[PDB]
Every structure is written in C-alpha cells, then in structure tokens.
RNA sequence: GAGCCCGGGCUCCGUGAGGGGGGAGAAGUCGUAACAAGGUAACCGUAGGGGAACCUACGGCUCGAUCACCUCCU
RNA sequence: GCCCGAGUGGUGGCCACUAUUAUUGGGCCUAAAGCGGCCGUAGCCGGGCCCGUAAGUCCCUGGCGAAAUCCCACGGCUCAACCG
RNA sequence: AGGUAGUUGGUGGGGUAACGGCCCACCAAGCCGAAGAUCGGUACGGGCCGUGAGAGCGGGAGCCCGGAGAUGGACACUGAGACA
C-alpha cells in the first residue's frame, strides 16, 4: 500500500508538475 | 469651503477610516483670509449658525497701540514685518493673532483674531 | 519544581487515607497546610498532628481517624462571591450536610459552614469531606 | 504657574509650563484620574503611559491580561523617565491622540520585565 | 529531592546536619573563626572549599550557626565575612566558576572541531550562565548594561 | 432623525410619573418649562389621570384655560406644563393644596396639605452667581430666579433654605443648612425621607461631594449636596405620612 | 495537567484554544463561513420554482433497481441545472414539459440523497402551482396546459 | 468642489473548447499484491526500475514469521 | 387499530440530545490524536518565615445600568391570553 | 505580518458654535504592531429574542431605544435647527 501510494502521489506530482513547469 | 470632520482621515494606528455619513451643516468650515494693510477698511458682517453675526475683516487701516498702562490709539500703520507662520505671509501683509507690524513709533505685536472678532489693536515691543 | 505545596500535602493525605495507613508524613510544610490542618482538626476530620521544624523544613505527622473521604485544593483558586457560594456549594461538596468548602477570608480561614455563619467570602483555597 | 491642583496631591517643584498645561491660559484640569507606567520619552514634551488592568471571562471563570496605551503630555517643569508610575489628568484635547496631561510624578530607578 | 537536568538520573541525597544551634564540644571565638577564613582566602582557595577545609580540619559544619548571633541582621558566613573586609570577588563565585570553565572549552573546540558532544555542552553551560546572569542583574551583583557573549566571557577571565 | 425629538411614546414615557404603560402608542410629552423632564409631571396628567376631572383632553384643556389650577401661585394655560417638584400647586375653586413629593418608591405623587403652607415654598437654589450692576441672584432648578441679598454671600454657598412668598413673587426668611438641621431628599434612591443632618463632611474630588444624614429610623443616607434639599428646621409635611 | 492552563490571567489562551478547535466541526465551520449557503444552489432557500427542461429516468443504487421518476428543471434566478426526484407512483404523467415546477430538498441538506437515489438532493412538490400529492388523488384538482 | 470622461494597471461577477480527481456501477482483461510464513515474512523512510498489482537496494521496526539450535527470567 | 386533534404532516434553518468542542464537563500505548530530542524568549504557573501597602479579593454604604419582555403577588376584562 | 507621510508629536496660526493635523506654515521623526496591528470577509448596535437543568450556544423579527439612508453621486440657500 503506502509504497504504492507514495510513488503514485510522487508520479502524479511530477508528471503534473512537469505539465506546470511546462 | 472646507468639509471635515475629521473622522475621515486615518486611524492613529494606520487604519483607513471611512466616512459613514455625509456632511453635517454645523460641521462645515470656511477658508482662510488675507487681511491687507491699506488706507481703507473693508469689512463685512457674516451670520454664524449659532445665530450671531460676526465680523470678518478683509482689510484694515488702523490698529493701535498699548503700553503696560494701556493707552489705546487709532492711528496709521505701515508694512507688516515678521509674521510667525510663513514669511510668504509677511510679503502680502496678512494680519494674524500673533503678527508683528510697524506702527507710528515702535514696533507692535498683534494680539487679536480679526477673522471672527473684527478688531485690530497691538502692544509695543520694548528693546 | 513543586507548586501548590498545600495540594501536594492534601493529595497525599487523601491517598494516604484511601490505603488506610495509620498516620502520615508530609515533608514540605507551611502555614497554608498548617492552618488548613488546623481548621480541619477544628471541624474534627483528623486526629492529632505534630510538626517538627527541621532546619530543612517543617514536617507534619498526622493521625488518621478514618473520617475523610475526599479533600482537595482548587486549581486556579477562583474568587467566589457570597451569593455564588450556593453554586459552588452544589458542585464540589457531596451534600448540604458537610460544608467544608475551605475558602480563605477577610476574617481568617474558615470552612464553608464557618464562613456562612459569619457572612464574608473570597477566593477558594481547598475542600474537605 | 505654581498653584494647588487639588486631588490631594502637590504641584511640581518648579514651574514654567506652556499654555497646554492646567497652570496657564485656557486648558484646565478636570475629572478622573488614572495610573500607568512610562514606556517611552522619545517625542518632544510627549510620553507614552501604557496601563495594565484585568478583565474577566464568564465562560472560563478566569481573568486575562490586557494593556491599554494612553498618550500623556509631560510639562517641561518635570521630566518623565522610563519605568515609573505617572499620574494623569483628564483634560480637553491637545491633539488627535493626546487628551491627557501629566500632573504628579513618582520617579524610580527600578525596572521589571 | 532530585532534578534530572540534562539527565534522567536522580540527584545525590547528600543532607545537612539538622543542628540549628552549634556544637559547644567544638570551641571558637568570633575572632578566631574570622582569622581562619581570612587565611584561607589568602591562599587562593574559594568559599565552598574554604567551608570544606574548615569542616574537615576545625570541625565547624557551616559558619552561620556558630557565628550568628554576633550582629543578628542575618547569618554571618564566609563571604559575608569576606565582604566586610573587601576580600570578596565582585562577581559571585557561582557565576565565576561557571564562566571560568567555559573559556577552556572554547579552546578545545578551536583545535578539534569535529566534536558533537563537546560542542553540545558549550550550549549546555552558556545557558546556565545566561540564567545566572539574568537574575543577578535584578538582584544586583552585575550591572544592567551588561550582556553575555563569548568575547565578553574572554575579557572577564583575563 | 437629525432634527429635534418632538414626540414621546407611552413605552418611552418614564415610570417615575406612574402613567399607564400600554394605554396607547403615544404619551403626553412635556414641553420645556420650570423643571427636568424625567423629574416632572404634566398638568394634563394631574387633571385626566390623577384627579379624574377629565375624560377627554378637550375637557382638561378647557379646564386649564378657565382656571382650575394655578402653578407657583400664578395662572397657566399650556396643557403641556411640567409641574415642578417640591412644588406648590393649588386648586383655587375648592382651596386645596398639594406638594409634588416623591414617594419612597420613586413615582411622582401629590400629597395634600392645607392652604396655610401654600404661601411658603422652600427653595434651595441650584446655583448662585454674580450678574452685572454689582448684584448676585438666587437660582432654582424649577427655574425661579430672584435678585437681591444685600451685597456678598451673608449666608451660605447654595445650600439655602429660602422662604418664598409665592403669590407675592418675593423672597423672605433665608436660613442655612447646618449640622443639626432638617433635609428632605428629592433625588436619589433614598427619596421621601426627611431627617436631621449628622454632618456635611465631604470628599469633593471630581463630581461626588458627600453629605450624610440619619433620619427618625436611623437609615444612613449619602446624597450629594444637590440631591439633598434643605427642608429647613421642619415646616411642610413628610411624603408618605 | 490535563490540558488547560489554569491560572487567573491565562484565560485568553483558553479563549483562543476553543475557537481554534471549534473549526474541526465541519458543520460549524461550514455555517460560520456559509458554505452551506453558497454551494448547493437555492441561495439557501426553503424552495425554488423552475422550468421543466425535460423528463429523465435514472437507475437505482446497489442492492436495488427501479426507475425513479426524475425531472430536469432549471431554477429561474439561480439559473442552475438541477436533476430531481419526483414523489408518487404514476406522477411523471401529470408533469408536462415546460410547466413551472417548484423544488425543495429531501432528507437533510448535507448532500444526502436518500438511500436508494444516488444524486438527487431535491424534491418536487408542484405542477402549475398545484402539487403532486394533490394529483395522486383524483378528486382534488387535475392539471392544465 | 460631485458626477462625468480618457489612457494604463490590478481584481471580481455571468459564461467556455479542453482538462483532474472523488464516491460508484460491478458480467469483460490482465496478474496474484496483501490477509495463513499468502507459498520470496510484513511494514517502514529514502532511491531506481517495471504495463499493473509490484520488484529490488540500503537503513530501521515488529504491529515477525514456524519448528529447530543456542542464550537468559519468576 | 394507535396518536393527536382544527390541526396534522413535508422540505429547509437554529438549539437540544452531542462531556461530537469538554468552564461546569472529553481525550491522545494499541481505537483519532505526543512534536524524532533539546533549549530558552513572550506567556502562564511558584517552598517557608516577618513587616508595609490594600492593586486583585471579600464586606458595607452610596451614585447608576429607561420602559417593555421574564418571575411572584394582588386587582381588571365571563375565563385566560392581555392589561393595571 | 509588517503598516503608516497630515502620517505621530512640537511651535505658531486659520477656520469653525466650539477642542482638535480639523486645515495650514515652520520644525521634529515619531506613531501603530505577535496582549495580532494592517488587510480581507461578514455584519446596523442595544433592550431583548430562541433554545438549553445549568453553564452555554445561536439570533437582531414586530415593539421600544440610538445611529444611518431617501434612484446612484455631489452641492448650497432659507431658517434655532436641513445640506432637506
């Protein structure tokens, strides 16, 4: 679980933060 | 003409205070005046809201003097020299409650408000 | 540190009580506690005490009859009007009978019942019943 | 200059006060009286006294600490100093924020907080 | 009894004599006692150790009990015996020993700086000084104009 | 509302007159006159409500134009007349006198006494001040002003007992208030008590200036010199007899 | 010390504590801001009239299936799209498209559609200023336009 | 000395292609992740990698594993 | 058949229940929730013993917090509401 | 989370029914703030009101009391009084 979520949250964050940074 | 009060400036704590009413008649005010040195006397009577007529001097030609016994006169004056407030005023001869002026013999110090009372007399300065 | 030395007296005295030892020892000692035990004895709740004043401290050795149920100090020590007494009457005490809500007063120190008979009040100090 | 002020207090040892003191002119002593402590002397003839009082809260049964600054005009006959009680008169306005004049000073070298 | 400060460990239970007036099987005059004190402060010993040697050699456990009454304003004891003579350090010994030590630390750290623990007691000794300062100011052994710092610690010691 | 308040409501009508409170939506409002508004009583009221002589105000007003009442030994006709306190009011068509006295309670009541006491009206004067022409004058807070006292004080500060010959508009028999004299209390929550003054010792700083008194009962009353009114050395009757 | 400062002058701390900790009641917070009043259209109101854009039927929830009668109505001043649950059996009949339909809530304003219905926050009372429970009974009045 | 206007800046209301997630619907598909040592104990913070569940490294923790083997403790 | 009764019910809001906002009168090992640990500023809170003040605090008096509404009495309207 | 430039104060003066930075000339650099200022939201305020065993919580409706307004916004006369 919290492994999952942390990396899902991180990937969401990055990918989206990539989309914001871009 | 001048509005005020005077509740419409700022708070002593840097708040903005906003007016939450309008004008009140009783609480309006008039503008300052220039009482000139001249040979003629230009007066006007004006009616206050307390219901009392008060004289405004718009010019004058006689002040005149007092000692430390107090023997008054009505005689000629000449140029206003030294006004406390601003030296600009001492050029255009604006009489004030604390003005200083040249009289016939000795300099004399004004000691009355001619913008509500309508009077000009002085007391001699001793060197 | 300590504070409320009284209270740390009282609280022993009660936890002392609840066990059913014979007598107590209270290492820190004072007027407050001294006086309060005095008034306490005056109502009778306790038997006899001796304090020995050591160059360190007063100590009270107190004799336990069995009477006391619960006797506790007040936390912020509230001021209480003589009209508000009845409220503080119903709350803290167990019923109308007991009446040692020990307050501190203009006259000195008293219980609740000794306060009411005079007629005077103030800030609360402790309770006993 | 130097006349009895009443309140059961004595007037300053020296006098030479300007017309914004109740020993001259048309500004006069009247009314209620307080006491408080000098924060600052920095403005000219002007001194901050901040009072401490307690207030009650009915909900919690307890008190609170509140602190009301009051602006006080010091007469040039006497100088205020930090950290001493000062006595205040209730008078008509000097200014936007100055409604008070200092009447009788009890001065002190001591300071807490 | 205890206070586990910067520790979890209960403090020593060392305890005073419950004597309130002094032994008379021990015998010294107000004059003799005063000499003993002055001699020891002349050595370079300090008041705790002065009270220590007097205890171990001359058999007086605390000075207050023996001396007072001889001017019953208060108890007469070592440094109050010293101040009347002018032998007292204007800094209280408490505050002095403290600061004294402190300046020694700094020199170690100077040369050795990779020291957690040694760094961490610098922080633990200053902050006792600070306190000891703070209250004295208000009591008055140290003027209110002072404030504590590591250059104003290296000046008091030298 | 930024002009003058020229109506009064019943609910806004003060209960120191014992008016009826919900009779209508509007009460009779005193005009200015002799004495204070929430210390007075309207002529209308004494007629319509107090003494029943009216049903409608068309009655009362007629009654006051013809002359069933004189106030202060003098005729009236404004049917909005505040009748003063400690006051002389006369019925001339029957020969009645009432004092406008406060009760213990604090409502305004009329207390009936004979015609003889209706020539005298104790004044304690509200202030005393110099005027031009080198005179002083005697004030009151029912307004009534008198001139003459033969230069300077000759008597007391303001706590006076005056004898006013009320039909004659004249002042007679001046008498101070002293530390064994009588006082009637007209203002305060100690009203309707008449007593013997213990002393006049005071703590004057600021507004309060203290005067104590103990009555026949012995109820210690602290009133202002002003709330205190000098009834004299005892002449008119006490309220609640 | 069980939390709180107790002490004469401390109270202010108390006074701010409560308030700080009050805002953990969703309901309280929400009202004191007015989120109840801003979000779930109405502008807060008891009820709202609106024009029946169309009639739609939706499915029931988890253990359930049955065709609930729902309208789509547009509130008129609110100007917001509301899908809605209609009381009664036959009903969907008596409601013509483009009659006025007054709308209310149903079963706590919280958002809670009743157990069966997913969405529906709201209720219908009326068809052309005469209600639905009056139109389930034949006699009482019958509809127009 | 108002309203009024003009040029710019900042903010807010009605409304818009497109875009994010939630509580769901539980008849399609992939896998077996966890819950039994779940069939490689599990979790944990950090880092990389994989379609997914997730795997691995390093450090921690037992809320840890089943006998066995060894060691202590009323 | 039960309730209530010219009412009864629906939606909405507020308060109670909710010691689910803890003053009265809540918790926080594992249920939600202890900061990874310390320091000390502001704050709150403070051992004993004597003396001054009486600021808080209590007691008494006195000025005062309009009427209305509330509570109690008596009186009025047939009764009560309502009013005096 | 820092705000403040008639801005805080001083001297002298104007204007006003009148005190006052109300306004103004000169001089000074204060004034306010974590005991929460400033800014933003929301809101007439009070008597009361609802509820609750109490403590408390919510509320400003008739009515009374005080203030503000009169299509938005400014402006004077006339009068004791209006900026009506």
From Swiss-Prot, chain B:
GO terms for cellular component: ribonucleoprotein complex; ribosome. It comes from the Archaea. InterPro entries: Ribosomal_eS8 (IPR001047), Ribosomal_eS8_CS (IPR018283), Ribosomal_protein_eS8_arc (IPR020919), Ribosomal_Se8/biogenesis_NSA2 (IPR022309). GO terms for molecular function: structural constituent of ribosome. GO terms for biological process: translation. The keyword Ribonucleoprotein applies. Keywords: Ribonucleoprotein, Ribosomal protein. Part of the 30S ribosomal subunit. Belongs to the eukaryotic ribosomal protein eS8 family. This is Small ribosomal subunit protein eS8. It comes from Pyrococcus abyssi (strain GE5 / Orsay). The lineage of its organism: Archaea, Methanobacteriati, Methanobacteriota, Thermococci, Thermococcales.
UniProtKB/Swiss-Prot annotation, chain C:
The keyword rRNA-binding applies. Gene3D superfamilies: 3.30.1370.30, 3.30.1490.10. This is Small ribosomal subunit protein uS8. Keywords: Ribonucleoprotein, Ribosomal protein, RNA-binding, rRNA-binding. Disulfide bonds: none annotated. Part of the 30S ribosomal subunit. Belongs to the universal ribosomal protein uS8 family. The keyword Disulfide bond does not apply. Transmembrane segments: none annotated. One of the primary rRNA binding proteins, it binds directly to 16S rRNA central domain where it helps coordinate assembly of the platform of the 30S subunit. It comes from the Archaea. It comes from Pyrococcus abyssi (strain GE5 / Orsay). One of its GO terms (biological process) is translation. One of its GO terms (cellular component) is ribosome. GO terms for molecular function: rRNA binding; structural constituent of ribosome.
Curated annotation (Swiss-Prot), chain D:
PROSITE patterns: RIBOSOMAL_S17. The keyword rRNA-binding applies. The keyword Ribonucleoprotein applies. One of its GO terms (cellular component) is cytosolic small ribosomal subunit. GO terms for molecular function: rRNA binding; structural constituent of ribosome. SUPFAM superfamilies: Nucleic acid-binding proteins. Belongs to the universal ribosomal protein uS17 family. Part of the 30S ribosomal subunit. One of its GO terms (biological process) is translation. One of the primary rRNA binding proteins, it binds specifically to the 5'-end of 16S ribosomal RNA. This is Small ribosomal subunit protein uS17. It comes from Pyrococcus abyssi (strain GE5 / Orsay).
Swiss-Prot record, chain E:
SUPFAM superfamilies: S15/NS1 RNA-binding domain. Signal peptide: none annotated. Residues 1-18 have a biased composition (Basic residues). Residues 1-21 are annotated as: Disordered. GO terms for molecular function: small ribosomal subunit rRNA binding; structural constituent of ribosome. The keyword Lipid biosynthesis does not apply. Gene3D superfamilies: 4.10.860.130, S15/NS1, RNA-binding (1.10.287.10). SMART domains: Ribosomal_S13_N, Ribosomal_S15. Keywords: Ribonucleoprotein, Ribosomal protein. One of its GO terms (cellular component) is cytosolic small ribosomal subunit. Pfam families: Ribosomal_S13_N (PF08069), Ribosomal_S15 (PF00312). InterPro entries: Ribosomal_uS15 (IPR000589), Ribosomal_uS15_arc_euk (IPR023029), Ribosomal_uS15_N (IPR012606), uS15_NS1_RNA-bd_sf (IPR009068). The keyword Ribosomal protein applies. GO terms for biological process: translation. HAMAP family: Ribosomal_uS15_A. Part of the 30S ribosomal subunit. Belongs to the universal ribosomal protein uS15 family. This is Small ribosomal subunit protein uS15. The gene is rps15.
């Amino acid at each position: 679980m919290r492994w999952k979520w942390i990396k899902k949250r991180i990937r969401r964050l990055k990918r989206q933060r990539k989309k914001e940074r871009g | 003409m001048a509005i005020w009060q005077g509740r419409s400036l700022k708070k002593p704590s840097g708040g903005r205070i906003v007016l939450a009413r309008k004008k009140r008649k009783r609480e309006l005010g008039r503008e300052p005046s220039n009482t000139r040195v001249a040979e003629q006397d230009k007066r006007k009577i004006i009616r206050t809201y307390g219901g009392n007529r008060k004289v405004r001097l718009t010019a004058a030609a006689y002040a005149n003097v007092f000692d430390k016994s107090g023997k008054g006169r009505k005689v000629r004056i000449i140029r206003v020299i030294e006004n406390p407030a601003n030296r600009q005023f001492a050029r255009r001869n604006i009489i004030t409650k604390g003005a200083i002026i040249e009289t016939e013999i000795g300099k004399a110090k004004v000691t009355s408000r001619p913008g509500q009372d309508g009077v000009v007399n002085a007391i001699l300065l001793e060197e | 540190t300590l504070l409320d030395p009284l209270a740390n007296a009282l609280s022993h005295i009660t936890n002392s009580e609840r066990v059913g030892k014979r007598e107590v020892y209270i290492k820190p000692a004072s007027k407050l506690i001294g006086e309060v035990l005095r008034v306490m004895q005056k109502y009778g709740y306790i038997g006899e005490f001796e304090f020995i004043d050591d160059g360190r401290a007063g100590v009270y050795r107190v004799q336990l009859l069995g009477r006391i149920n619960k006797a506790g100090a007040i936390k912020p020590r509230f001021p209480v009007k003589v009209s508000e007494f009845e409220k503080w009457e119903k709350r803290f005490l167990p019923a109308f009978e007991f009446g040692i809500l020990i307050v501190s007063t203009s006259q000195g120190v008293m219980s609740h019942k000794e306060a009411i008979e005079k007629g005077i009040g103030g800030r609360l100090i402790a309770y006993v019943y | 200059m130097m006349r009895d002020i009443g309140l059961r207090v004595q007037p300053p040892a020296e006098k030479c006060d300007d017309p914004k003191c109740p020993w001259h002119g048309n500004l006069k002593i009247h009314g209620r009286v307080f006491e408080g402590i000098v924060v600052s002397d920095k403005p000219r003839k002007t001194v901050t006294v901040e009072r401490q009082y307690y207030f009650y809260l009915n909900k919690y049964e307890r008190y609170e600490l509140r602190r009301s600054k009051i602006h006080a005009h010091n007469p040039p006959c006497i100088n205020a100093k930090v950290g001493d009680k000062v006595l205040i008169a209730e008078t008509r306005p000097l200014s936007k924020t100055k409604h008070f004049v200092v009447v009788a000073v009890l001065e002190r070298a001591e300071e807490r907080r | 009894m205890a206070r586990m400060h910067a520790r979890k460990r209960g403090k020593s239970g060392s305890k005073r004599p419950p004597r309130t007036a002094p032994p008379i099987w021990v015998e010294y005059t107000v004059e003799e006692i005063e000499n003993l004190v002055v001699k020891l402060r002349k050595e370079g010993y300090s008041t705790a150790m002065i009270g220590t040697i007097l205890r171990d050699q001359y058999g007086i456990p605390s000075v207050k009990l023996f001396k007072d009454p001889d001017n019953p304003n208060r108890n007469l004891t070592i440094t109050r015996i010293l101040e009347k003579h002018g032998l007292a350090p204007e800094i209280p010994e408490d505050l002095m020993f403290l600061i004294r030590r402190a300046v020694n630390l700094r020199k170690h750290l100077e040369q050795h700086p990779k020291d957690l623990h040694s760094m961490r007691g610098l922080q633990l000794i200053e902050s006792k000084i600070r306190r000891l300062v703070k209250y004295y100011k208000r009591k008055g052994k140290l003027p209110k104009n002072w404030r504590y710092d590591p250059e104003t610690a290296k000046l008091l010691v030298r | 509302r930024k002009g003058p308040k020229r109506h009064l409501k019943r609910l806004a009508a003060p209960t120191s007159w014992y008016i009826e409170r919900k009779a209508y939506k509007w009460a009779v409002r005193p005009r200015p006159g002799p004495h204070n508004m929430r210390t007075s009583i309207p002529l209308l009221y004494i007629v319509r409500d107090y003494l029943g002589y009216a049903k409608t105000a068309r009655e009362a007003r007629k009654i006051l134009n013809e002359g069933k009442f004189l106030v202060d030994g003098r005729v009236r006709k404004d049917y909005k007349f505040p009748v003063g306190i400690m006051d002389v009011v006369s019925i001339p068509e029957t020969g009645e006198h009432y004092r406008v006295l406060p009760n213990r309670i604090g409502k305004l009541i009329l207390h009936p006494i004979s015609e003889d006491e209706a020539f005298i009206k104790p004044l304690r004067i509200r202030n005393k001040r110099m005027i031009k022409g080198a005179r002083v004058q005697l004030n009151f807070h029912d307004g009534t002003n008198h001139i003459v006292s033969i230069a300077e004080k000759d008597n007391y500060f303001t706590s006076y007992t005056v004898l006013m010959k009320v039909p004659e508009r004249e002042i007679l028999e001046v008498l101070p208030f002293e530390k064994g004299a009588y006082v009637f209390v007209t203002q305060g929550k100690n009203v309707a008590r008449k007593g013997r003054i213990v002393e006049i010792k005071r703590f004057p700083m600021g507004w309060p200036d203290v005067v104590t008194i103990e009555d026949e009962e012995g109820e210690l009353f602290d009133t202002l010199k002003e709330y205190a009114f000098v009834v004299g050395t005892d002449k008119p009757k006490i309220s609640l007899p | 010390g069980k939390k709180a400062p107790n002490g004469e002058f401390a109270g202010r701390k108390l006074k701010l504590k409560r308030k700080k900790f009050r805002w953990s009641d969703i309901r309280y917070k929400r009202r004191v801001l007015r989120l109840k009043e801003k979000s779930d259209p109405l502008e807060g109101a008891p009820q709202a009239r609106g024009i029946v854009l169309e009639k739609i039927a939706v499915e029931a929830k988890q253990p359930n299936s049955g065709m609930r009668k729902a309208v789509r109505v547009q509130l008129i001043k609110n100007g917001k799209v509301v899908t809605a649950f209609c009381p009664g059996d036959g009903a969907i009949k008596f409601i013509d498209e483009h009659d006025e339909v007054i709308i209310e809530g149903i079963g706590g304003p919280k958002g809670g559609s009743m157990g069966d219905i997913p969405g529906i926050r709201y209720k219908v009372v009326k068809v052309n200023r005469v209600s639905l429970k009056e139109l389930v009974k034949g006699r009482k009045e019958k509809p127009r336009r």
